[PDB]
Amino acid sequence: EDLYPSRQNNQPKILKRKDPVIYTDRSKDNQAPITKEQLDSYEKNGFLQIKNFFSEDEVIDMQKAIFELQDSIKDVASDKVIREPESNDIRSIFHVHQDDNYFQDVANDKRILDIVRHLLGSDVYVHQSRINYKPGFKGKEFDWHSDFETWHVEDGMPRMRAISVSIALSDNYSFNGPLMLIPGSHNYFVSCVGLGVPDEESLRELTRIGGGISVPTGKAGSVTLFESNTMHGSTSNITPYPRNNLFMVYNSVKNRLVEPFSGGEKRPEYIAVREKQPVY
Amino acid sequence: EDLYPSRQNNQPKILKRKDPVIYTDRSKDNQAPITKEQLDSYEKNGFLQIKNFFSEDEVIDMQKAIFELQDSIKDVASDKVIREPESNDIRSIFHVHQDDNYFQDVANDKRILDIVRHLLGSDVYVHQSRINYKPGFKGKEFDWHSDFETWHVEDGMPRMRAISVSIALSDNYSFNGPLMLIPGSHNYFVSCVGLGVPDEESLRELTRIGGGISVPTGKAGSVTLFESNTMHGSTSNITPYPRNNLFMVYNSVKNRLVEPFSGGEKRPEYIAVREKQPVY
């Protein structure tokens, strides 16, 4: 049963969300690790920024850890390690939540799990992880998209029951190509043409409904959580201020991947997790 | 005598500014139409934003006027009128300060003249004017540059004694590709390689000296004045919020153009004014 068909024709359409946003009853706000106000802001906007999530030592430790890993894998040949063609410089590393002990501990951090389990109303597992290295002046624009539309079409994610967690590992300014989100857009599924980038008309409609464009900013260490279907994008960075980050996607154990809704072949494990965690 | 050589080799260098910034004595701040604080902010940063420069009716009148002119010239064949190749839609119109009565009155507005004459310490004339039409989702990134470096090399402007005046005719947000400036950068001349875009190393050095990147924002009608040599640029606009503007450059009558410092041919009048205004 495909509740969110996309890329099946050349006519875009906006379909209504058929899933809860916050899956734990609001009568149980007292059990959450965040406030009623934070819960309401997530429900309404489709994302939540939390500043001072980590202590200053934890921030510095994480920043050192990404560059220590980058140096440690300089000679590695792996499809998980994305390199710039000309320099061979490492731009991204996938699947660190599983492959490295330090990043596994970050991915299992109770402060993160307590939130995502509350919001998703179940236990969770990591769908994907990635470290991004984005030096000053690097990283092209990313057109607006819903992660969900890709997870669904290409990876077989059935329902809107996953949350992305972005840890800023550089200071996040308005001017260096920050993540931008359309508030409220998680309530609307944009079918895309027969890739996965919505048309301008749909984007205008979402922006009108949301009242604008949201651009969280903050010091290194700040955390942005965003719902699976929240529309987001970024401009290029023409400034010397980098944009390094650690990205993890938490999916409900009740929403495990099936075959790609496109009818196509599975993507690699490092892109979309199909491991079911063993008893031992 | 070339005080600011550029594009003559392939080694960039930073040369010191050899001209005043504010050409009227600071002992005469009382004669200016702006405050000591505004004067100091211009001197330090190389730009000044003024919100509520125009009354609300004047803002609405100017917005209507750009689109009335755009419609009036739909069938025109002119090198002053810049059109998108595919749609033929009008993206810019040069030389309105001279060619249209309404835009001439804007260019002669006493509120603008009183400021630029104070800052340039002399009478002024308009070097260039342009209306830009930048609908939602349109207008590519503009790499960092100093207008002065172009005016000098290509148009024969001798010294740093011109000011650009940008009137926002759309709301100016942080997220839709606003003008960004490097504060303090007007004090440093970046020679460019043998076009006119400075190298990353120089840009890092300016940004370090300035302490960051400045991005004025404000409602339609807000005015940004910037010194001839202030480094500025913008990202692309991936949002539906337009960026229409009226841009005028005021040059001191003591700094009239000579032959291009490149040794090349003059550009057209609509790009760089060489008319000396007649007595009648």
Side-chain angles (χ1 to χ4, degrees):
Chain A
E1 160 76 317
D2 191 347
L3 294 181
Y4 303 113
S6 183
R7 309 197 201 171
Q8 296 176 355
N9 54 59
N10 292 331
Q11 305 312 309
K13 200 162 133 49
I14 293 175
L15 316 179
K16 295 142 163 230
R17 175 185 190 96
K18 286 158 181 263
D19 293 308
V21 176
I22 294 182
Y23 282 76
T24 303
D25 260 76
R26 302 307 306 277
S27 71
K28 296 191 183 90
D29 285 3
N30 61 281
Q31 297 165 41
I34 44 167
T35 68
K36 176 197 188 279
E37 289 68 41
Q38 291 175 293
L39 291 157
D40 287 344
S41 183
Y42 176 81
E43 181 182 90
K44 183 184 199 186
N45 292 327
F47 68 89
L48 180 66
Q49 189 191 32
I50 308 301
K51 306 170 156 176
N52 307 313
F53 192 100
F54 290 107
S55 62
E56 289 183 68
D57 56 306
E58 291 173 323
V59 175
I60 287 169
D61 283 353
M62 290 191 39
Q63 298 169 312
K64 286 169 49 189
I66 303 296
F67 287 107
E68 284 177 43
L69 179 59
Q70 194 188 56
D71 193 48
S72 284
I73 69 149
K74 62 184 103 176
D75 299 317
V76 167
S78 175
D79 285 353
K80 77 177 175 134
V81 181
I82 310 298
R83 294 173 189 270
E84 293 186 347
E86 60 314 327
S87 60
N88 223 230
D89 288 351
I90 292 170
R91 297 290 299 280
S92 297
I93 305 167
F94 285 92
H95 213 243
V96 299
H97 69 279
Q98 159 121 291
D99 295 353
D100 182 280
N101 279 146
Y102 175 72
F103 293 100
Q104 181 178 310
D105 289 346
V106 177
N108 289 315
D109 195 287
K110 187 190 160 54
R111 294 162 289 194
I112 298 172
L113 298 180
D114 283 350
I115 298 171
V116 299
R117 286 170 170 148
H118 190 92
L119 299 171
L120 296 177
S122 69
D123 286 335
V124 302
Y125 74 99
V126 173
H127 165 83
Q128 189 187 275
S129 69
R130 197 177 167 151
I131 298 162
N132 303 123
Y133 303 94
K134 294 199 167 176
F137 305 110
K138 302 293 224 280
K140 277 170 142 73
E141 102 141 68
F142 269 110
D143 277 354
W144 295 103
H145 61 291
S146 161
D147 286 339
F148 178 79
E149 191 275 350
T150 291
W151 298 338
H152 183 78
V153 170
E154 302 187 38
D155 302 313
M157 193 179 283
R159 295 184 167 251
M160 300 180 179
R161 206 218 283 202
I163 296 171
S164 294
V165 174
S166 178
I167 303 168
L169 291 175
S170 287
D171 294 328
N172 186 22
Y173 296 102
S174 89
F175 55 71
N176 68 327
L179 178 63
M180 313 188 269
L181 305 108
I182 306 181
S185 58
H186 58 309
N187 282 139
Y188 307 96
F189 180 76
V190 185
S191 318
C192 290
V193 302
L195 282 155
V197 168
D199 61 288
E200 287 177 11
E201 171 175 350
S202 293
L203 291 165
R204 291 177 179 275
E205 177 165 346
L206 299 174
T207 302
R208 177 170 217 95
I209 294 165
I213 295 311
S214 294
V215 187
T217 61
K219 308 289 179 53
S222 285
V223 174
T224 310
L225 300 98
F226 57 100
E227 201 284 318
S228 66
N229 186 57
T230 304
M231 200 65 200
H232 66 280
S234 58
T235 68
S236 69
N237 180 12
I238 64 166
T239 81
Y241 293 91
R243 300 175 280 178
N244 305 314
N245 85 309
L246 171 61
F247 180 78
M248 302 172 296
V249 181
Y250 294 88
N251 190 23
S252 166
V253 298
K254 298 186 172 186
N255 192 47
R256 292 180 194 278
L257 309 181
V258 301
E259 299 289 340
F261 286 87
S262 64
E265 316 215 291
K266 288 166 180 185
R267 301 204 289 172
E269 188 65 3
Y270 272 39
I271 299 294
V273 166
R274 293 174 186 281
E275 183 175 9
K276 249 46 129 209
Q277 285 304 122
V279 158
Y280 65 67
Chain B
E1 160 76 317
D2 191 347
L3 294 181
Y4 303 113
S6 183
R7 309 197 201 171
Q8 296 176 355
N9 54 59
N10 292 331
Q11 305 312 309
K13 200 162 133 49
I14 293 175
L15 316 179
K16 295 142 163 230
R17 175 185 190 96
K18 286 158 181 263
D19 293 308
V21 176
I22 294 182
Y23 282 76
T24 303
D25 260 76
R26 302 307 306 277
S27 71
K28 296 191 183 90
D29 285 3
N30 61 281
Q31 297 165 41
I34 44 167
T35 68
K36 176 197 188 279
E37 289 68 41
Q38 291 175 293
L39 291 157
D40 287 344
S41 183
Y42 176 81
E43 181 182 90
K44 183 184 199 186
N45 292 327
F47 68 89
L48 180 66
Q49 189 191 32
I50 308 301
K51 306 170 156 176
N52 307 313
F53 192 100
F54 290 107
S55 62
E56 289 183 68
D57 56 306
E58 291 173 323
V59 175
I60 287 169
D61 283 353
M62 290 191 39
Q63 298 169 312
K64 286 169 49 189
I66 303 296
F67 287 107
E68 284 177 43
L69 179 59
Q70 194 188 56
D71 193 48
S72 284
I73 69 149
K74 62 184 103 176
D75 299 317
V76 167
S78 175
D79 285 353
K80 77 177 175 134
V81 181
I82 310 298
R83 294 173 189 270
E84 293 186 347
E86 60 314 327
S87 60
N88 223 230
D89 288 351
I90 292 170
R91 297 290 299 280
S92 297
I93 305 167
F94 285 92
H95 213 243
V96 299
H97 69 279
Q98 159 121 291
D99 295 353
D100 182 280
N101 279 146
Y102 175 72
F103 293 100
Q104 181 178 310
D105 289 346
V106 177
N108 289 315
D109 195 287
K110 187 190 160 54
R111 294 162 289 194
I112 298 172
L113 298 180
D114 283 350
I115 298 171
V116 299
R117 286 170 170 148
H118 190 92
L119 299 171
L120 296 177
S122 69
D123 286 335
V124 302
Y125 74 99
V126 173
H127 165 83
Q128 189 187 275
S129 69
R130 197 177 167 151
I131 298 162
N132 303 123
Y133 303 94
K134 294 199 167 176
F137 305 110
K138 302 293 224 280
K140 277 170 142 73
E141 102 141 68
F142 269 110
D143 277 354
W144 295 103
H145 61 291
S146 161
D147 286 339
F148 178 79
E149 191 275 350
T150 291
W151 298 338
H152 183 78
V153 170
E154 302 187 38
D155 302 313
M157 193 179 283
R159 295 184 167 251
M160 300 180 179
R161 206 218 283 202
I163 296 171
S164 294
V165 174
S166 178
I167 303 168
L169 291 175
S170 287
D171 294 328
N172 186 22
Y173 296 102
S174 89
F175 55 71
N176 68 327
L179 178 63
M180 313 188 269
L181 305 108
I182 306 181
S185 58
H186 58 309
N187 282 139
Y188 307 96
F189 180 76
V190 185
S191 318
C192 290
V193 302
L195 282 155
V197 168
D199 61 288
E200 287 177 11
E201 171 175 350
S202 293
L203 291 165
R204 291 177 179 275
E205 177 165 346
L206 299 174
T207 302
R208 177 170 217 95
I209 294 165
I213 295 311
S214 294
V215 187
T217 61
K219 308 289 179 53
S222 285
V223 174
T224 310
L225 300 98
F226 57 100
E227 201 284 318
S228 66
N229 186 57
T230 304
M231 200 65 200
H232 66 280
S234 58
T235 68
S236 69
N237 180 12
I238 64 166
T239 81
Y241 293 91
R243 300 175 280 178
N244 305 314
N245 85 309
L246 171 61
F247 180 78
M248 302 172 296
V249 181
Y250 294 88
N251 190 23
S252 166
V253 298
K254 298 186 172 186
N255 192 47
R256 292 180 194 278
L257 309 181
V258 301
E259 299 289 340
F261 286 87
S262 64
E265 316 215 291
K266 288 166 180 185
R267 301 204 289 172
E269 188 65 3
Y270 272 39
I271 299 294
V273 166
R274 293 174 186 281
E275 183 175 9
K276 249 46 129 209
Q277 285 304 122
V279 158
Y280 65 67

